[PDB]
Design a protein around this ligand. Structure first.
Ligand SMILES: [Ca+2]
Ligand SMILES: [Ca+2]
Ligand SMILES: [Ca+2]
Ligand SMILES: [Ca+2]
Ligand SMILES: [Ca+2]
Ligand SMILES: [Ca+2]
Ligand SMILES: [Mg+2]
Lengths: 374, 451
């Protein structure tokens, strides 16, 4: 019964460079040798360091009711860069959009004049409908978000709900297309003011093929399968965003904030907020959202074989311990929070080599625990 | 439990036709049972996807089918200053097919309608307009309760009261035993949804070829509501008929709504006047609550109970806190005037991303045990994500949570096997109902003959 640390590195203090060796979790690798019908424990010392680079992909709704908010995003990049600089020295910003499936009965298909712009009857010019439209990849240059905005226009769909869920998946899984960093914590800001669309909103448009975790954004920066793919469900929406180590932040208006605050319960790592209908309250929303998601150290277990289970104890701020707790709240910058995990196997499995990971949600570093039997 | 998966039957149509979407039994006057399968993407005469319906005989080997003939030509008329147009391109004729007695009502939820007036127009909106036929007698008629010449400016100045332009009539087609045609139009009345009932006999006896805009005398429709709670119900997504009042004179209308009460979902029960009697909110929000309904008597007492599908019912697990396995609720019907309340039974799936509950089909006395059984759909269940059909049996307490028989998908990956299900008809006269299932990815239909 040995749990010797296979490799361990000192936890960093301040990150000015060489982010590839931050090593925010210690120990990194521990070899577990459990004799049949027994148990063992190992110690974990998660500690999130200051100046940890992060990347932010700003996903936005752009229906007709969503127009007036777009008139306050022309300088979001500069303002967000200054605010996030106090907490992180390296920021990456991205931009996306969505309206809905460009298909009947969501678009103005009549007359053939209206197929080029739906809002022809009210003497206004609007772009044709689109399901998802990638515009900007996450680049450390602050000016990219400033230039991308004030160029995009507003589309027009008939009903109230929008195709936001379609746009979030193309953000989640198109890692190479957008440029997710593997050594950072990812924040996905999803802003809307009205309802959103779910599965079997397809047959109402004849679009029945369900969404899959694949990336269908081609070389045109467009959801090429918009009019043939359905909407993504809750298990698809992030179980696929947990998989990419991503944190989702709802930013919705008060008239719809009730369900979203009622909906973050079933999808983890999510902090709902209130967006002023002029989108002047999103800069403070995203900053405060990270503060809660940062000082809420959890412990997600991935690829855990059914032959064994894990028992969790917590040692949060102050020496007081909380038995049967796998998460600590109310932390701050640089806090060191210990944990205790007891691993119990049933008899001896006929594998003799398995590996599961103990990971803080939305964070690259994890304990690659290797369990063997003798 | 007795539906064998070994001996199969495979009816296939045109390739890339999405054949097998909407499928029904069809009993003639002599007792022979035919099969009316829809195919909303079959090409028409003009090299365009105008949908199609194929009347497939009963063959032990299956194969191709002879297609029913419908008017798939655009019509244009000039009455006064108004020019009436009906468009049939990309209409999906077959996307909602129903057959009763000797009449096939094969409906196209995307047959558009428009009216022209000098410069102004009534817009080509997907009102939905759907066909009727009597193959044994060769009689043809059409019905479209949401056709009107009201202009755009009038609707704007009035602000969208009695707006049937976006009906998609025929989407949910259930025909009462009396002979009344019930349509569901989830886009009508400001995109909240409606229900439209007109008699079948009146429909046949009050249609004249070549008149695009006409109204039936007996047309009775629902009422628009200004309640912000009711906004975007998609009310009419799946109408069902059954005894939910206690009087045999009135056949009540069970209507599902995927979205209600701030994106929660609901299933309403209303009488022939479309007045609310009962309403069942969603237990978990945006969990696919408000699409699938199946009025069947699960418990065997004699009181018509209720089922609701919910394929995106996500629950918790140990390895990860997310499990989208889908769930099928049970709402029993208590004795007396007591309403339907908390869900009597919660059926859980096992395969993650299982899409379990997309279709519910009352298979009748499948085992001849004395209680009605159902078969819950799973287009992409199973270990490999190919498809599953899970049969739950009925009993005095409700449904057994253990699927007695699970039918795996003969077709390869992507066929959406199990999407559309129909039952309670003896296709082989062997004493047990024979179940037919539609898979449009494979453009095929698998007929299982119960042992
Ligand atoms: Ca929409
Ligand atoms: Ca606004
Ligand atoms: Ca009644
Ligand atoms: Ca009953
Ligand atoms: Ca039974
Ligand atoms: Ca049989
Ligand atoms: Mg809007």
């Amino acid at each position: 019964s040995e749990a010797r640390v296979l490799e361990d590195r000192p936890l960093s203090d301040k990150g000015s460079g060489d982010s590839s060796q931050v090593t925010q979790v210690s120990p990194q690798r521990i070899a577990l040798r459990l004799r049949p019908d027994d148990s063992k424990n190992f110690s974990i010392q998660v500690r999130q360091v200051e100046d940890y680079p992060v990347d932010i992909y700003y996903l936005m709704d752009l229906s007709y009711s969503m127009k007036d908010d777009l008139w306050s995003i022309q300088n979001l990049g500069t303002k967000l860069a200054t605010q996030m600089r106090k907490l992180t020295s390296n920021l990456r910003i991205g931009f996306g959009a969505f309206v809905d499936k460009p298909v009947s009965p969501y678009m103005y298909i009549s007359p053939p004049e209206a197929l080029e712009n739906p809002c022809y009857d009210m003497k206004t010019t609007c772009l044709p409908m689109f399901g998802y439209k990638h515009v900007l990849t996450l680049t450390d240059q602050v000016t990219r978000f400033n230039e991308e905005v004030k160029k995009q226009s507003v589309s027009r769909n008939r009903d109230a709900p929008e195709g936001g869920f379609d746009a979030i998946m193309q953000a989640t899984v198109c890692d190479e297309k957008i440029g997710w960093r593997n050594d950072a914590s990812h924040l996905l800001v999803f802003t809307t003011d009205a309802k959103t669309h779910i599965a079997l909103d397809g047959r109402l448009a004849g679009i029945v093929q369900p969404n899959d975790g694949q990336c269908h954004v081609g070389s045109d920066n467009h959801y090429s399968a918009s009019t043939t793919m359905d909407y993504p469900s809750l298990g698809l929406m992030t179980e696929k965003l947990s998989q990419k180590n991503i944190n989702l932040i709802f930013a919705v208006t008060e008239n719809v904030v009730n369900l979203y605050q009622n909906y973050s319960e079933l999808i983890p790592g999510t902090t709902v907020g209130v967006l002023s209908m002029d989108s002047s309250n999103v800069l403070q929303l995203i900053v405060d959202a990270y503060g809660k998601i940062r000082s809420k150290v959890e412990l997600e277990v991935r690829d855990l074989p059914e032959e064994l289970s894990l028992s969790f104890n917590a040692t949060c701020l102050n020496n007081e311990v909380i038995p049967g707790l796998k998460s600590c709240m109310g932390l701050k910058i640089g806090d060191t929070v210990s944990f205790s995990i007891e691993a119990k196997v049933r008899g001896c499995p006929q594998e003799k080599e398995k590996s599961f990971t103990i990971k803080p949600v939305g964070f690259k570093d994890s304990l690659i625990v290797q369990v063997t039997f003798d | 439990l007795n539906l064998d998966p070994v001996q199969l039957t495979f009816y296939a149509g045109p390739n890339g036709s999405q054949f097998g979407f909407s499928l029904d039994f069809h009993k003639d006057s002599h007792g022979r049972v035919a099969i009316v399968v829809g195919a909303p993407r079959t090409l028409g005469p003009s090299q365009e996807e105008t949908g199609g319906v194929f009347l497939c005989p009963w063959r032990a080997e299956g194969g191709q089918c002879p297609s029913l003939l419908f008017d798939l030509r655009d019509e244009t008329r000039n009455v006064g200053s108004q020019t009436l147009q009906t468009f049939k391109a990309r209409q999906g004729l077959g996307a909602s097919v129903v057959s009763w007695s000797d009449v096939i009502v094969a409906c196209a939820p995307w047959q558009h309608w428009n009216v022209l007036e000098k410069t102004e127009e009534a817009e080509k909106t997907p009102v939905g307009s759907c066909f009727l036929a009597q193959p044994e007698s060769g009689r043809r008629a059409e019905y479209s309760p949401c056709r009107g010449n009201t202009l755009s400016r009038i609707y704007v100045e009035n602000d969208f009261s009695w707006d049937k332009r976006y009906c998609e009539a025929g989407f949910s087609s259930v025909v009462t035993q009396a002979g009344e045609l019930v349509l569901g139009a989830p886009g009508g009345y400001y995109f909240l949804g409606l229900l439209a009932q007109a008699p079948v006999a009146d429909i046949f006896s009050s249609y004249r070829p070549g008149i695009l805009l006409w109204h039936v005398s007996s047309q009775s429709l629902s009422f628009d509501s200004s309640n912000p709670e009711y906004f975007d119900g998609y009310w009419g997504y799946s109408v069902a008929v059954g005894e939910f009042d206690g009087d045999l004179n009135t056949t009540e209308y069970v209507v599902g709504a995927p979205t209600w009460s701030w994106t929660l979902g609901a299933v309403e029960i209303l009488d022939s006047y479309y007045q609310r009697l009962h309403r069942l909110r969603g237990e978990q929000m945006a969990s696919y609550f408000g699409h699938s309904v199946a009025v069947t008597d699960v418990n065997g007492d004699g009181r018509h109970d209720l089922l609701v599908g919910a394929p995106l019912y996500m629950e918790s697990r140990a390895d990860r806190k997310l499990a989208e396995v889908g769930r099928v609720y049970l709402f029993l019907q208590p004795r007396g005037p007591h309403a339907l309340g908390a869900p009597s039974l919660l059926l859980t799936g096992t395969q993650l991303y299982g899409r379990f509950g997309s279709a519910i089909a009352p298979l009748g006395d499948l085992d001849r045990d004395g209680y009605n059984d159902i078969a819950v759909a799973a287009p992409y269940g199973g270990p490999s994500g190919r498809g599953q059909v899970l049969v739950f049996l009925g009993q005095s307490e409700g449904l057994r949570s253990r699927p007695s028989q699970v039918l795996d998908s003969p077709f390869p990956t992507g066929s959406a096997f199990g999407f559309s299900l129909r039952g309670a008809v003896d296709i082989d006269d062997n004493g047990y109902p024979d179940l037919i299932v539609g898979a449009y990815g494979a453009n095929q239909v698998a007929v299982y003959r119960a042992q």
